[PDB]
Ligand binder design. Structure first.
Ligand SMILES: Nc1ncnc2c1ncn2[C@@H]1O[C@H](COP(=O)(O)OP(=O)(O)OP(=O)(O)O)[C@@H](O)[C@H]1O
Ligand SMILES: [K+]
Ligand SMILES: [K+]
Ligand SMILES: [Mg+2]
Ligand SMILES: [Mg+2]
Ligand SMILES: [Mg+2]
Ligand SMILES: [Mg+2]
Ligand SMILES: [Mg+2]
Ligand SMILES: [Mg+2]
Ligand SMILES: [Mg+2]
Ligand SMILES: [Mg+2]
Ligand SMILES: [Mg+2]
Ligand SMILES: [Mg+2]
Ligand SMILES: [Mg+2]
Ligand SMILES: [Mg+2]
Ligand SMILES: [Mg+2]
Ligand SMILES: [Mg+2]
Ligand SMILES: [Mg+2]
Ligand SMILES: [Mg+2]
Lengths: 118, 109, 134, 35, 103, 105, 112, 408, 53, 43, 81
RNA sequence: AAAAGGGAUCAAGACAAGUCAUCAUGGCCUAAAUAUUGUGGGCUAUAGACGUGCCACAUUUUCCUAAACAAAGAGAUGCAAAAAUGUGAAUUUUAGCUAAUCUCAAAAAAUAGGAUAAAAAUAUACAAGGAUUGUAGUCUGAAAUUCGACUGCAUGAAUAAG
């Protein structure tokens, strides 16, 4: 089925589908299902076409999108523009939270950017 | 609390409530200490004056706290196990076993 | 305790108190070589029952005067008393004063001792200095 | 009569009687205990 | 369960090669080698169901395949027996009897 | 043949049939489970530690009633006291005997 | 330096940093109540905001010797700060050397 | 760049949906290797009520096993596939409970009972014997295999308009499908006597009652058909309406707040679920059964939460029966009680299950030995050994010590 | 099964009796600093003072 | 005027109130009044 | 002060607001842990980094941070030259 | 009872082995500085590379429920119950004990049930995993920015047993 323009398979859990959107986690997932009387173990192919449309209208009123990424990307961009310590660690791809840099800084070198994945 | 014979049943229970965690339901004793002062004589005097207030407050007919049930969550009650009295090999039980020992032989025979 | 008529029970062997320290045998680097140390405290318990309060204090006074070196002692004394402790301790003042008439000679100070200052604060601070901090 | 607080410490008497048992095993001499 | 084991002597077969020689093994060593082969075939098989009987039933099925002769452990038994027959003469090899007797 | 362990029944206490058979093995080996009632009181240790401890306890108590069973309890293994004990941890070792990784270079 | 007594009053192993740590212990003893008062006014959310801010500033102006966090035990025989045992006031090594000679009462080589 | 070594990157048909779950839930009720026990009798329609059958093992009829299997009376944790023919031990507790069901259905009354016991003492199987006595005597058995499937939020649920109740359509549908097969014979003899307006199909009065149940082909109208069916089975004055056995296993699950969430994200109480709200009413006596029957609720220890209200109620009912002037009371400072659980359990009867007697333990061991599954000499010395290792005859523990061992 | 407002009447009685702080709202009153006993004099005596020589 | 696009002034005032906000008020002389000449030697 | 209920960490600073259009000198501070308060906006600081005093001009985006977060103590690590 | 076990101890000599940065000491140097005091910073930097561990890569694992069984150690420079408050870290308030008494304090694995599977390779079925980062808090302490420890929410990297 389709929820907010994303296609999901029948054998997929409705909760795991909602939780696949950025910013939508366990708390929001449990409250969206409770709002429309969907048990956590509901599969995707069992939802009526009426409720599948209600979920799309529900997620459209939430901050679960690139919109949520902008909030995170803006916080990082601000740290750099101000000229703070943390901001300069994102730009150089270095650990930002006081980790030791002599060894084991792989994930920092790979993910720490100004334009992070999210 | 039962040593204070000048108190009534309702008043003795009210005293157990004011004591709070100082009351031991299993032994029925109110143990309370004091080391607030520099000299041991002063700690004894305080407890003496304090026990007089506990009794005066218990006699106060303003609020008997009968609505409040006695709270014993501060105490951890212990359950003791004892040897079963039905297993004691007495002259009466010996006859009981002889019957069971003999019925077993018949059932198999 | 027998001569004083005190029925004593024990000595009850209480559990041993064992401290442990593992230290390197060398002050400098060498760390793969350590050794264990300990300090085991051996202790006993003598409990007296149906003992008169005063008689129990003569027993304790006797043990302290003839204490054996290398032994530490601690006593917990019990005693039954009536209600009205405040008044009881005020009436016994005259009784204790008579017993001290001949004992005041131990202390002596210049008229209006000024080195003491605040009496209560002197005891509180002088007691800490005697005990080494607390 | 007596006090209740007093009676609550008399009943706690589950002591073991000193048996004065007779030794049936041979005992050696204790070690030399240095000072 | 195999009846023999292959022990090797270091550097006695030629240019750094070892001298493999068969030898018998007691019962406990025979059963241990056998059952460990069975567990090796079991662990490599894929999962089938769920519950607490997965591993148990997966092993029992291999025990039945062994008695029916259609198991894979029979190949490992014959493979080690071939090495024994192919090296039955090394029991009296000149190298095993001339260690330090050629001064 | 009623057996109690700390007030609880033999099955309510040991959740492992292997431990139940070992606790009363003396009575089983001599074929006297239905002749005596045992009231055990164990403390400390674990499930198997306590089970094997009751084996020796009942064996000794049983010999007080029928002293002529010791030759049988011998071959049953209920008279011997197993002295095995956990070895302490030793400095320089990860455990009683496990040593840390030794680096040659 | 103002907290260093002009007359040495140490009978243990004297050191440049032992005198330094002894001066901090004496300074904190003299200003612990004054310091506890400030730490109380700050954490008392029932007081006015200005009262809590005044005490928060005065606590920042007190000399460093008055802070208890700057007190670190040292060896009274060697003067080190690493490996000190509170029960003996000595390094792990001086504890070993004195324990084997019999200068620490009650201590003995352990074996079990 | 980095010069360290790095392990450079780099079978069978998979199972179908539901294949794995069906593997650990299938029930085997036979074993060709097992020996046929000689002299093994089959349960007659009135064998679970005779006092003389106590301590004897008898085989279940063939048609009963089809009905019990239809409503999931057997369970995988039970040892059925070790023997050839499903057989049960007629137990002194079976005769007691069964003699009450017999009198209840005959006098038109209703017994509201609760079964309690230790981990594995025969609670779930004592119902299997109650349902067995129900099928053989032409009753209407409505069994709920697992009460945790109604509370753990693992099935669809929808609200009812203008009411706090909640329906579970997908479960109610599956419940009707299994209700037909089990009671196919009894239902064939009954016809409708009321005019049900709202239904997936039009159904005139005096029609085959089995047709009314076949109307529920979709989950949506499943609950509506159920309520209509419930009205028919409980017809006030209609000849041919047999007693009803409304049984539920896992009572501890429906005696707390469920795991479902309402639109406000507040836990729904188990007694609000329309289906659970029906059983509790029948168990509390609120909903009367005009034709009579029995409402049995069996607790469980495997995967069961603790409800102080149910445990307190069970304790109070046993105290009143024994006649003790003092009955257990609430902990005046505990906040784990539930007023609604107390009201439902305020008049039920308790049936405590404990280990079997040494005479019953023999009849059960001889059945295992006759089947070649217990290679031992079944005598008093051997019965007392198993009776002791099983903790005074706990049937569940007696199987682990005799059947699930590694000595034979 | 007893109102909280009714229990406070008993909790307040104990405070008036044993002279303790009655703070049912859990307000941060800094009293944890008042109960903490000083440790200055215990630390000052660490290093032995100069003595006979 | 007084536009905080990043929301740092609103976040501060929400945590510590408007006592430290400039104007024309804990900042009257608490920070400046305590600043004395030669406060710390070495600038 | 991390915990919010204890307020921000304030330190004495010669923060005297100048007359409109007056030339005010920047504030030299070694208090690298002083929280930037809303009243610091518009002021010019010279935060000590251990050796030098790196200049800073407080803006509304810096409120809530520490002064030491704008003066690097170490120099970036660069391999080669 | 018994075919017991472990710990400590393990010499002289060599390695001009380690330590003149515990202490101590000969010679030689510094003595307005190679001595002494504070504020801030640094010892926490990071291309490549080498050692120790921790944890993970799901089917004997992990997750959920429940009414089992330990030993030893710690609290006068302090352990803190019960209750109440908070999703949580934790807070409010101190009963008792300076201890075989009171408190930390609860064992876990196990045992017995239960849930989940095309449990990652067919992209409409992306497993397990918890690094990285955003943000809101708590505790200790003048002080948590360089540079602390935990908590909530979100983010969801490599990782096919080498
Ligand atoms: N009357 C009986 N005849 C034969 N076997 C029985 C009988 N009663 C119980 N058993 C067996 O005892 C074991 C446990 O029985 P059962 O499952 O009914 O217990 P339970 O009380 O429902 O347990 P739980 O609390 O875990 O749900 C099963 O193997 C069962 O077959
Ligand atoms: K171990
Ligand atoms: K994990
Ligand atoms: Mg590395
Ligand atoms: Mg399991
Ligand atoms: Mg059950
Ligand atoms: Mg030597
Ligand atoms: Mg050299
Ligand atoms: Mg070397
Ligand atoms: Mg060197
Ligand atoms: Mg030197
Ligand atoms: Mg410095
Ligand atoms: Mg370092
Ligand atoms: Mg608590
Ligand atoms: Mg702990
Ligand atoms: Mg897989
Ligand atoms: Mg995942
Ligand atoms: Mg930080
Ligand atoms: Mg490896």
């Amino acid at each position: 089925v389709f929820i907010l323009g994303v296609n999901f398979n029948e054998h997929k859990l409705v909760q795991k589908a909602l939780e696949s959107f950025y910013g939508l986690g366990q708390q929001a997932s449990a409250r969206i299902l409770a709002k429309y009387s969907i048990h956590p173990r509901a599969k995707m192919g069992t939802l009526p076409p009426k409720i599948v449309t209600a979920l799309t209208a529900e997620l459209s009123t939430m901050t679960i999108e690139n919109d949520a990424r902008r909030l995170v990307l803006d916080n990082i961009k601000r740290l750099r523009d101000m000229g703070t310590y943390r901001g300069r660690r994102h730009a150089m791809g270095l650990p930002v939270r006081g980790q030791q840099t002599r060894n084991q800084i792989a994930n920092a070198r790979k993910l720490n950017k100004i334009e992070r994945h999210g | 609390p039962k040593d204070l014979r000048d108190l009534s049943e309702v008043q003795q229970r009210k005293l157990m409530k004011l004591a709070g965690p100082r009351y031991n339901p299993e032994k029925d004793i109110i143990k309370m200490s004091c080391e607030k002062f520099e000299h041991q004589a002063q700690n004894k005097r305080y407890l003496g004056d304090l026990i007089e207030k506990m009794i005066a407050a218990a006699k106060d007919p303003k609020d008997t706290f009968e609505d409040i049930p006695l709270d014993t969550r501060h105490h951890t009650f212990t359950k003791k196990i004892s040897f079963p009295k039905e297993w004691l090999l007495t002259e009466e039980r010996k006859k009981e076993l002889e019957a069971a020992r003999q019925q077993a032989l018949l059932k198999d025979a | 305790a027998y001569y004083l008529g005190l029925p004593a029970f024990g000595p009850v062997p209480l559990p041993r108190m064992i401290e442990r320290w593992t230290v390197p045998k060398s002050h400098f680097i060498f760390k793969k070589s350590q050794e264990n140390f300990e300090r085991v405290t051996l202790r006993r318990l003598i409990q007296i029952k149906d003992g008169h309060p005063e008689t129990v204090q003569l027993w304790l006074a006797f043990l302290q005067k003839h204490a054996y070196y290398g032994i530490g002692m601690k006593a917990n004394v019990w005693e039954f008393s009536k209600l009205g402790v405040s008044k009881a301790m005020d009436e016994s003042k005259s009784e204790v004063e008579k017993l001290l008439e001949t004992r005041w000679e131990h202390l002596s100070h210049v008229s209006d001792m000024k080195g003491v200052g605040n009496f209560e604060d002197f005891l509180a601070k002088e007691r800490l200095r005697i005990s080494g901090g607390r | 009569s007596a006090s209740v607080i007093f009676s609550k410490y008399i009943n706690n008497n589950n002591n073991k009687l000193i048996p004065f048992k007779i030794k049936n095993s041979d005992l050696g001499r204790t070690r030399y205990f240095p000072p | 369960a195999p009846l023999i084991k292959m022990r090797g002597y270091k550097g006695l077969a030629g240019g750094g090669r070892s001298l493999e020689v068969p030898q018998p093994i007691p019962a406990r060593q025979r059963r241990s080698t056998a059952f460990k082969w069975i567990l090796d075939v079991v662990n490599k098989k894929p999962s089938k169901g769920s519950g607490r009987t997965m591993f148990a039933h997966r092993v029992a099925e291999e025990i039945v395949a062994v008695v029916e002769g259609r198991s894979s452990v029979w190949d490992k038994r014959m493979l080690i027996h071939k090495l024994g027959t192919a090296n039955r003469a090394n029991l009296n090899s000149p190298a095993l009897q001339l260690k330090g007797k050629r001064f | 043949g009623e057996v109690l362990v700390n007030g609880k029944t033999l099955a309510e206490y040991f959740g492992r049939v292997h431990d139940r058979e070992s606790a009363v093995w003396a009575l089983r080996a001599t074929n006297r489970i239905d002749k005596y009632n045992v009231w055990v009181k164990v403390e400390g240790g674990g499930t198997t530690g306590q089970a094997e401890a009751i084996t020796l306890a009942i064996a000794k108590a049983l010999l007080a009633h029928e002293p002529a069973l010791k030759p049988a309890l011998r071959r049953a293994g209920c008279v011997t006291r197993d002295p095995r004990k956990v070895e302490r941890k030793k400095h320089g070792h990860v455990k009683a005997r496990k040593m840390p990784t030794w680096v040659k270079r | 330096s103002m907290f260093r007594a002009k007359k040495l009053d140490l009978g243990c192993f004297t050191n440049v940093r032992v005198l330094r740590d002894h001066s901090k212990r004496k300074a904190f003893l003299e200003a612990e109540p004054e310091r506890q008062a400030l730490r109380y006014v700050i954490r008392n959310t029932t007081l006015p905001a200005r009262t809590r801010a005044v005490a928060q500033l005065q606590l920042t102006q007190m000399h460093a010797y008055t802070r208890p966090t700057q007190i670190r035990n040292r060896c009274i025989l060697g003067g080190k700060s690493r490996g000190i045992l509170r029960d003996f006031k000595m390094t792990r090594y001086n504890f070993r050397m004195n324990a084997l000679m019999g200068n620490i009462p009650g201590v003995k080589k352990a074996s079990w | 760049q980095k010069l360290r070594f790095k392990k450079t990157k780099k079978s069978g048909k998979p199972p179908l949906p539901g294949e794995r779950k069906a593997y650990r839930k299938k029930i085997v009720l036979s074993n060709n290797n097992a020996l046929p026990v000689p002299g093994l009798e089959t349960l007659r329609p009135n064998d679970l009520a005779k006092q003389d059958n106590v301590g004897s093992v008898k085989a279940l009829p063939e048609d009963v096993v089809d009905a019990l299997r239809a409503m999931e009376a057997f369970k995988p944790t039970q040892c059925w596939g070790i023997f050839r023919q499903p057989s049960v031990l007629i137990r002194q507790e079976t005769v007691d409970l069964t003699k009450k069901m017999k009198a209840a259905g005959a006098d038109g009354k209703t017994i509201r009972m609760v079964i309690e016991g230790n981990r594995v003492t025969g609670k779930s199987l004592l119902l299997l014997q109650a349902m067995t006595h129900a099928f053989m005597n032409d009753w209407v058995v409505l069994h709920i295999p697992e009460a945790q499937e109604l509370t753990t939020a693992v099935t669809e649920y929808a609200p009812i308009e203008n009411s706090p109740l909640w329906t579970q359509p997908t479960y109610t549908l599956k419940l009707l499908q299994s209700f037909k097969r089990a009671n196919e014979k009894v239902l064939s003899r009954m016809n409708t006597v009321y005019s049900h307006a709202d239904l997936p199909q039009i159904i005139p009065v005096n029609s085959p009652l089995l047709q009314l149940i076949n109307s529920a082909k979709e989950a949506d109208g499943a609950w509506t058909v159920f309520q209509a069916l419930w009205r028919e089975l409980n017809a006030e004055n209609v000849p041919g309406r047999p007693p009803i056995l409304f049984s539920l296993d896992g009572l501890a699950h429906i005696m707390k707040v469920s795991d479902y969430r309402n639109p406000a994200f507040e836990l729904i109480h188990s007694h609000d679920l329309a289906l659970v709200k029906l059983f509790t009413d029948c168990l509390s006596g609120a909903t009367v059964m005009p034709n009579g029957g029995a409402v049995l609720g069996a607790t469980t220890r495997g995967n069961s939460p603790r409800s102080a209200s149910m445990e307190l109620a069970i304790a109070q009912r046993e105290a009143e029966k024994a006649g003790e002037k003092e009955v257990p009371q609430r902990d005046p400072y505990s906040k784990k009680y539930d007023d609604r659980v107390e009201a439902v359990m305020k008049s039920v009867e308790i049936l405590r299950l404990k280990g079997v007697s040494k005479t019953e333990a023999r009849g059960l061991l001889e059945y295992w030995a006759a089947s070649g599954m217990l290679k031992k000499r079944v005598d008093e010395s051997m019965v007392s050994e198993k009776w002791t290792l099983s903790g005074n005859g706990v049937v569940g523990e007696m199987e682990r010590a005799s059947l699930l061992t590694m000595k034979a | 099964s007893v109102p909280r407002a009714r229990l406070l009447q008993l909790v307040k009685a104990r405070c008036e009796l044993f002279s303790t702080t009655f703070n049912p709202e859990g307000i941060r009153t800094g009293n944890k600093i008042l109960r903490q006993r000083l440790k200055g004099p215990a630390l000052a005596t660490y290093y032995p003072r100069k003595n006979v020589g | 005027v007084e536009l905080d696009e990043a929301g740092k002034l609103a976040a501060f005032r929400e945590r510590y109130g408007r006592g430290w906000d400039l104007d024309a008020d804990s900042l009257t002389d608490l920070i400046s009044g305590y600043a004395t000449e030669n406060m710390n030697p070495g600038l | 002060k991390r915990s919010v209920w204890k307020g921000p960490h304030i330190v004495p600073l010669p923060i005297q607001r100048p007359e409109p259009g007056k030339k005010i000198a920047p504030i030299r501070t070694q208090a690298r842990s002083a929280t930037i308060l809303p009243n610091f906006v518009g002021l010019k600081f010279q935060v000590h980094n251990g050796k030098d005093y790196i200049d800073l001009t407080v803006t509304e985006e810096m409120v809530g941070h520490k002064l030491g977060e704008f003066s690097a103590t170490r120099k970036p690590f660069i391999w080669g030259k």
